[PDB]
Design an enzyme around this catalytic site. Structure first.
Site, PDB file in Angstrom:
ATOM      1  CD  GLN A 428      -2.576   1.540  -0.147  1.00 10.58           C
ATOM      2  OE1 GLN A 428      -3.331   0.818  -0.798  1.00 10.58           O
ATOM      3  NE2 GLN A 428      -2.184   2.707  -0.611  1.00 10.58           N
ATOM      4  CD  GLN A 450      -6.812   1.068  -0.579  1.00 11.15           C
ATOM      5  OE1 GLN A 450      -7.695   1.905  -0.351  1.00 11.15           O
ATOM      6  NE2 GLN A 450      -6.425   0.783  -1.816  1.00 11.15           N
ATOM      7  CG  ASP A 475     -15.386  -7.061 -15.992  1.00 13.99           C
ATOM      8  OD1 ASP A 475     -16.043  -6.874 -17.046  1.00 13.99           O
ATOM      9  OD2 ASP A 475     -14.407  -6.362 -15.663  1.00 13.99           O
ATOM     10  N   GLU A 504     -11.746 -18.021 -28.091  1.00  7.43           N
ATOM     11  CA  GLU A 504     -13.043 -18.399 -27.538  1.00  7.43           C
ATOM     12  C   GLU A 504     -13.622 -17.293 -26.645  1.00  7.43           C
ATOM     13  CG  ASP A 533     -21.005  -2.894 -17.745  1.00  8.25           C
ATOM     14  OD1 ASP A 533     -21.224  -2.024 -16.870  1.00  8.25           O
ATOM     15  OD2 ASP A 533     -20.902  -2.629 -18.964  1.00  8.25           O
ATOM     16  CG  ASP A 645     -15.939  -3.313 -13.247  1.00 10.98           C
ATOM     17  OD1 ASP A 645     -16.453  -4.369 -13.684  1.00 10.98           O
ATOM     18  OD2 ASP A 645     -16.537  -2.215 -13.227  1.00 10.98           O
TER      19      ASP A 645
HETATM   20 MG    MG Z   1      -4.598   1.375  -2.877  1.00 11.01          MG
END
Ligand code: MG
Length: 670
Positions: A428, A450, A475, A504, A533, A645
DNA sequence: TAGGTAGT
């Protein structure tokens, strides 16, 4: 009832009966997306389509077609009917080049240095109470003010270097074309383009001379990748990505774009009055107000406790503990490194105090929780932002085997975090300039969330059990992978991040089967909701009925589209409504004006039973509750699909697929 | 390094 419902204006305007076709005509190719004539394609051996008018001579360009049947607009399915009204407006009434001249008059251009900002119109058509509404919206495009021919200093050999770069044809700032070819001058082709600006775009001869100046007929003729028509650089302008702009320019341009939903509504109503095809008043729509559902953390004594927001989650100085800690990381001392930028190495004394205080406070939680601790005794290291590979060159030479962590202190990247993960190192990063100016530890608190989400820790969950055993975010997009699913449980808790290998093109029936057969997740006799989506093909329908009968599961799917044409004329948030079978989802508040999420094609497959579901208050609540499951410091789109995503974008950025950690829901890719 | 903010 009063606190639960609010009426607001939407960007829908009723199309006048004069411009609505009463009959549709079916045809098929007797002798590609032929959207130019405003059709609707239904494929077979010979492609078959519908038109919002009759083609008297069954030919136009030379393609020979054959008549099938004639049907009244009211009899055809609303989804198709809407697409045919738009086509009639586009192909017969030519709404597109008219909306172009209307906007230029309303929204004038904005020039900052070498760049110019224009606006363009977006439109859709929706059916409500037997009538048709035009969803009218507008966006922006930034281009090089000085046209291409003058930009290359009227040199063809120089223009040839611009081959493969994105351009816009001046009267049409919506379409961003790609240059492919540069060839010999044709004065006839320049007169062809010039007539198009006067015949299609309806520009006066004076307007041609005012904007383009004295037309050079000795100009080279160029061709673009996306269309077979000719182009001339005097009529074109170079476009670019917004992010590519110099920060100084972006800040100056902002003022033109940044508009409140109400202020933007005033311009759409300004544009709507001028367009002769529609009525001047926007549509009044009744919205539900989502209940701000609580979250579930743990007490000092490890008992579940209700919290409405994560802003108080790490405000120690009342004390909340994690709900779940993965089997691996539980009560471990992590080998941790602190990588600092060489530019800010003249402030390290203060940087040492910042991290030490954060971890010193983290340890107050970490001691009576079974949370992983952090070990960084003599592990303080230096790196360079333009240095690149040097930091990882020394890092590869290390002996890390076990999962490890790294806090990155810079002076203003996705490239370094990807290379660091290859040695099983979760990272991070931090920009010191912002961390030094931390008022009451707002960032310090947002950091801890986070780093924990990155370490598969499920700190908070939902205070409500959904009727679904699984909520899957899907997705589909270098590793023989074509997409992934992110699986959440009944309480909105991440379970797995599962990539899908292509056999494919990747479709839903194959994904469901791969999940059962190759991914070892029980999908039999369960309630599964898929958030995607995209849209399901008519051919997939009979296959989805088969799999749901075999598994004996209730499989549902709903299309969640971030990019749509809707806009609500309110500063309000936490609201939802339906118009033309579409969910207008507005969960979040923005200091610079929000945009709704479109919700459509809600299908159900219950043990071999295809059923179409209308957008409830139920799912809209459920989908809202999921936007609150934000571990990265709420969200516009539900957490399952959002994190899917993020994983697919990471794959494109050549990230390692660490199955062990993905199996326990570690969001390292974020 | 947080979130959101194919007709010349
Ligand atoms: Mg970050």
């Amino acid at each position: 009832m009063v606190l639960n419902k609010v009426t607001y204006k939407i960007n829908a305007y009723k199309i006048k009966e004069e411009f609505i076709p009463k009959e549709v005509h079916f045809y098929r190719i007797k002798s590609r997306f032929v959207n130019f004539y405003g059709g609707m394609i239904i494929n077979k051996k010979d492609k078959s389509f519908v038109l919002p008018y009759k083609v008297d001579n069954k030919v136009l360009k030379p393609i020979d077609i054959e008549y099938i049947k004639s049907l009244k607009l009211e009899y055809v399915k609303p989804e198709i009917a809407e697409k045919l009204v738009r086509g009639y407006l586009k192909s017969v009434h030519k709404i597109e080049p008219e909306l172009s001249r209307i906007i230029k008059n309303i929204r004038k251009h904005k020039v900052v240095e070498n760049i110019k900002v224009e606006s363009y119109c977006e439109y859709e058509v929706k059916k409500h109470d037997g009538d048709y509404y035009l969803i009218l919206n507008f966006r922006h495009t930034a281009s090089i003010t000085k046209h291409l021919w003058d930009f290359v200093n009227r040199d063809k050999a120089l223009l040839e270097e611009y081959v493969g770069k994105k351009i816009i044809f001046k009267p049409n700032p919506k379409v961003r074309y790609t240059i492919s070819l540069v060839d010999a001058p044709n004065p006839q082709k320049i007169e062809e383009i010039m007539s198009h600006i006067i015949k299609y775009y309806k520009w006066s001869e004076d307007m041609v001379k005012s904007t383009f100046g004295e037309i050079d007929y000795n100009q080279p003729i160029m061709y673009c990748e996306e269309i077979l028509e000719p182009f001339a650089p005097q009529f074109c302008n170079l476009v670019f990505y917004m992010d590519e702009l110099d920060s100084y320019i972006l800040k100056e341009l902002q003022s033109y774009w940044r508009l409140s939903n109400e202020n933007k509504g005033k311009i759409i109503n300004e544009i709507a009055k001028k367009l002769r095809f529609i009525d001047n008043t926007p549509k009044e729509l009744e919205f539900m107000k989502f209940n701000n559902t609580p979250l579930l953390v743990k007490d000092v004594n490890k008992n579940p406790t209700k919290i409405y927001s994560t802003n108080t989650l790490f405000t120690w100085i009342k004390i909340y503990l994690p709900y779940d800690v993965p089997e691996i990381i539980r009560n471990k001392n992590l080998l941790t490194y602190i990588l600092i930028d060489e530019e800010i190495k003249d402030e390290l004394k203060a940087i040492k105090d910042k991290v030490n205080k954060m971890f010193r406070n983290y340890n107050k939680i970490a001691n009576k929780t079974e949370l992983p601790k952090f070990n960084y005794a003599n592990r303080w290291k230096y790196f360079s932002t333009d240095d690149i590979r040097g930091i990882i060159k020394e890092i590869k030479s290390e002996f890390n085997d076990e999962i490890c962590f790294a806090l990155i202190i810079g002076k203003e990247y996705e490239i370094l975090k990807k290379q660091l993960f290859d040695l099983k190192i979760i990272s991070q990063n931090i920009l010191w300039e912002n961390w030094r100016k931390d008022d009451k530890g707002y960032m310090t608190n947002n950091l801890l969330i986070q780093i924990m989400g990155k370490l598969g820790i499920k700190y908070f969950i939902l205070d409500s059990k959904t009727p679904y055993d699984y909520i899957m975010g899907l997705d589909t997009g270098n590793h023989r992978v074509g997409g992934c699913t992110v699986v959440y449980d009944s309480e909105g808790k991440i379970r797995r991040i599962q990539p899908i290998e292509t056999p494919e093109r990747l479709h839903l029936p194959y994904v469901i089967e791969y999940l059962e057969n190759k991914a070892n997740i029980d999908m039999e006799n369960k309630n599964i909701l898929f958030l995607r989506d995209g849209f399901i093909q008519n051919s997939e329908r009979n296959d989805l009925k088969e799999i749901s009968k075999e598994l004996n599961s209730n499989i549902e799917v709903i299309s969640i589209r971030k990019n749509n044409k809707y806009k609500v004329f309110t500063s309000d948030y936490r609201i939802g409504s339906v118009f033309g079978n579409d969910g207008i989802f507005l969960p979040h508040k923005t200091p610079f004006g929000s945009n709704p999420v479109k919700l459509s094609t809600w299908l159900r497959f219950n043990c071999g039973n295809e059923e179409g579901l209308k957008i409830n208050e139920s799912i809209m609540q459920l989908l809202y509750d999921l936007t609150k499951m934000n571990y990265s410091a709420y969200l516009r789109i539900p957490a399952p699909i959002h994190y899917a995503d993020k994983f697919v974008k990471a794959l494109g950025k050549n990230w390692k697929i660490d199955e062990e950690l993905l199996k326990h829901g570690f969001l390292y890719f974020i």
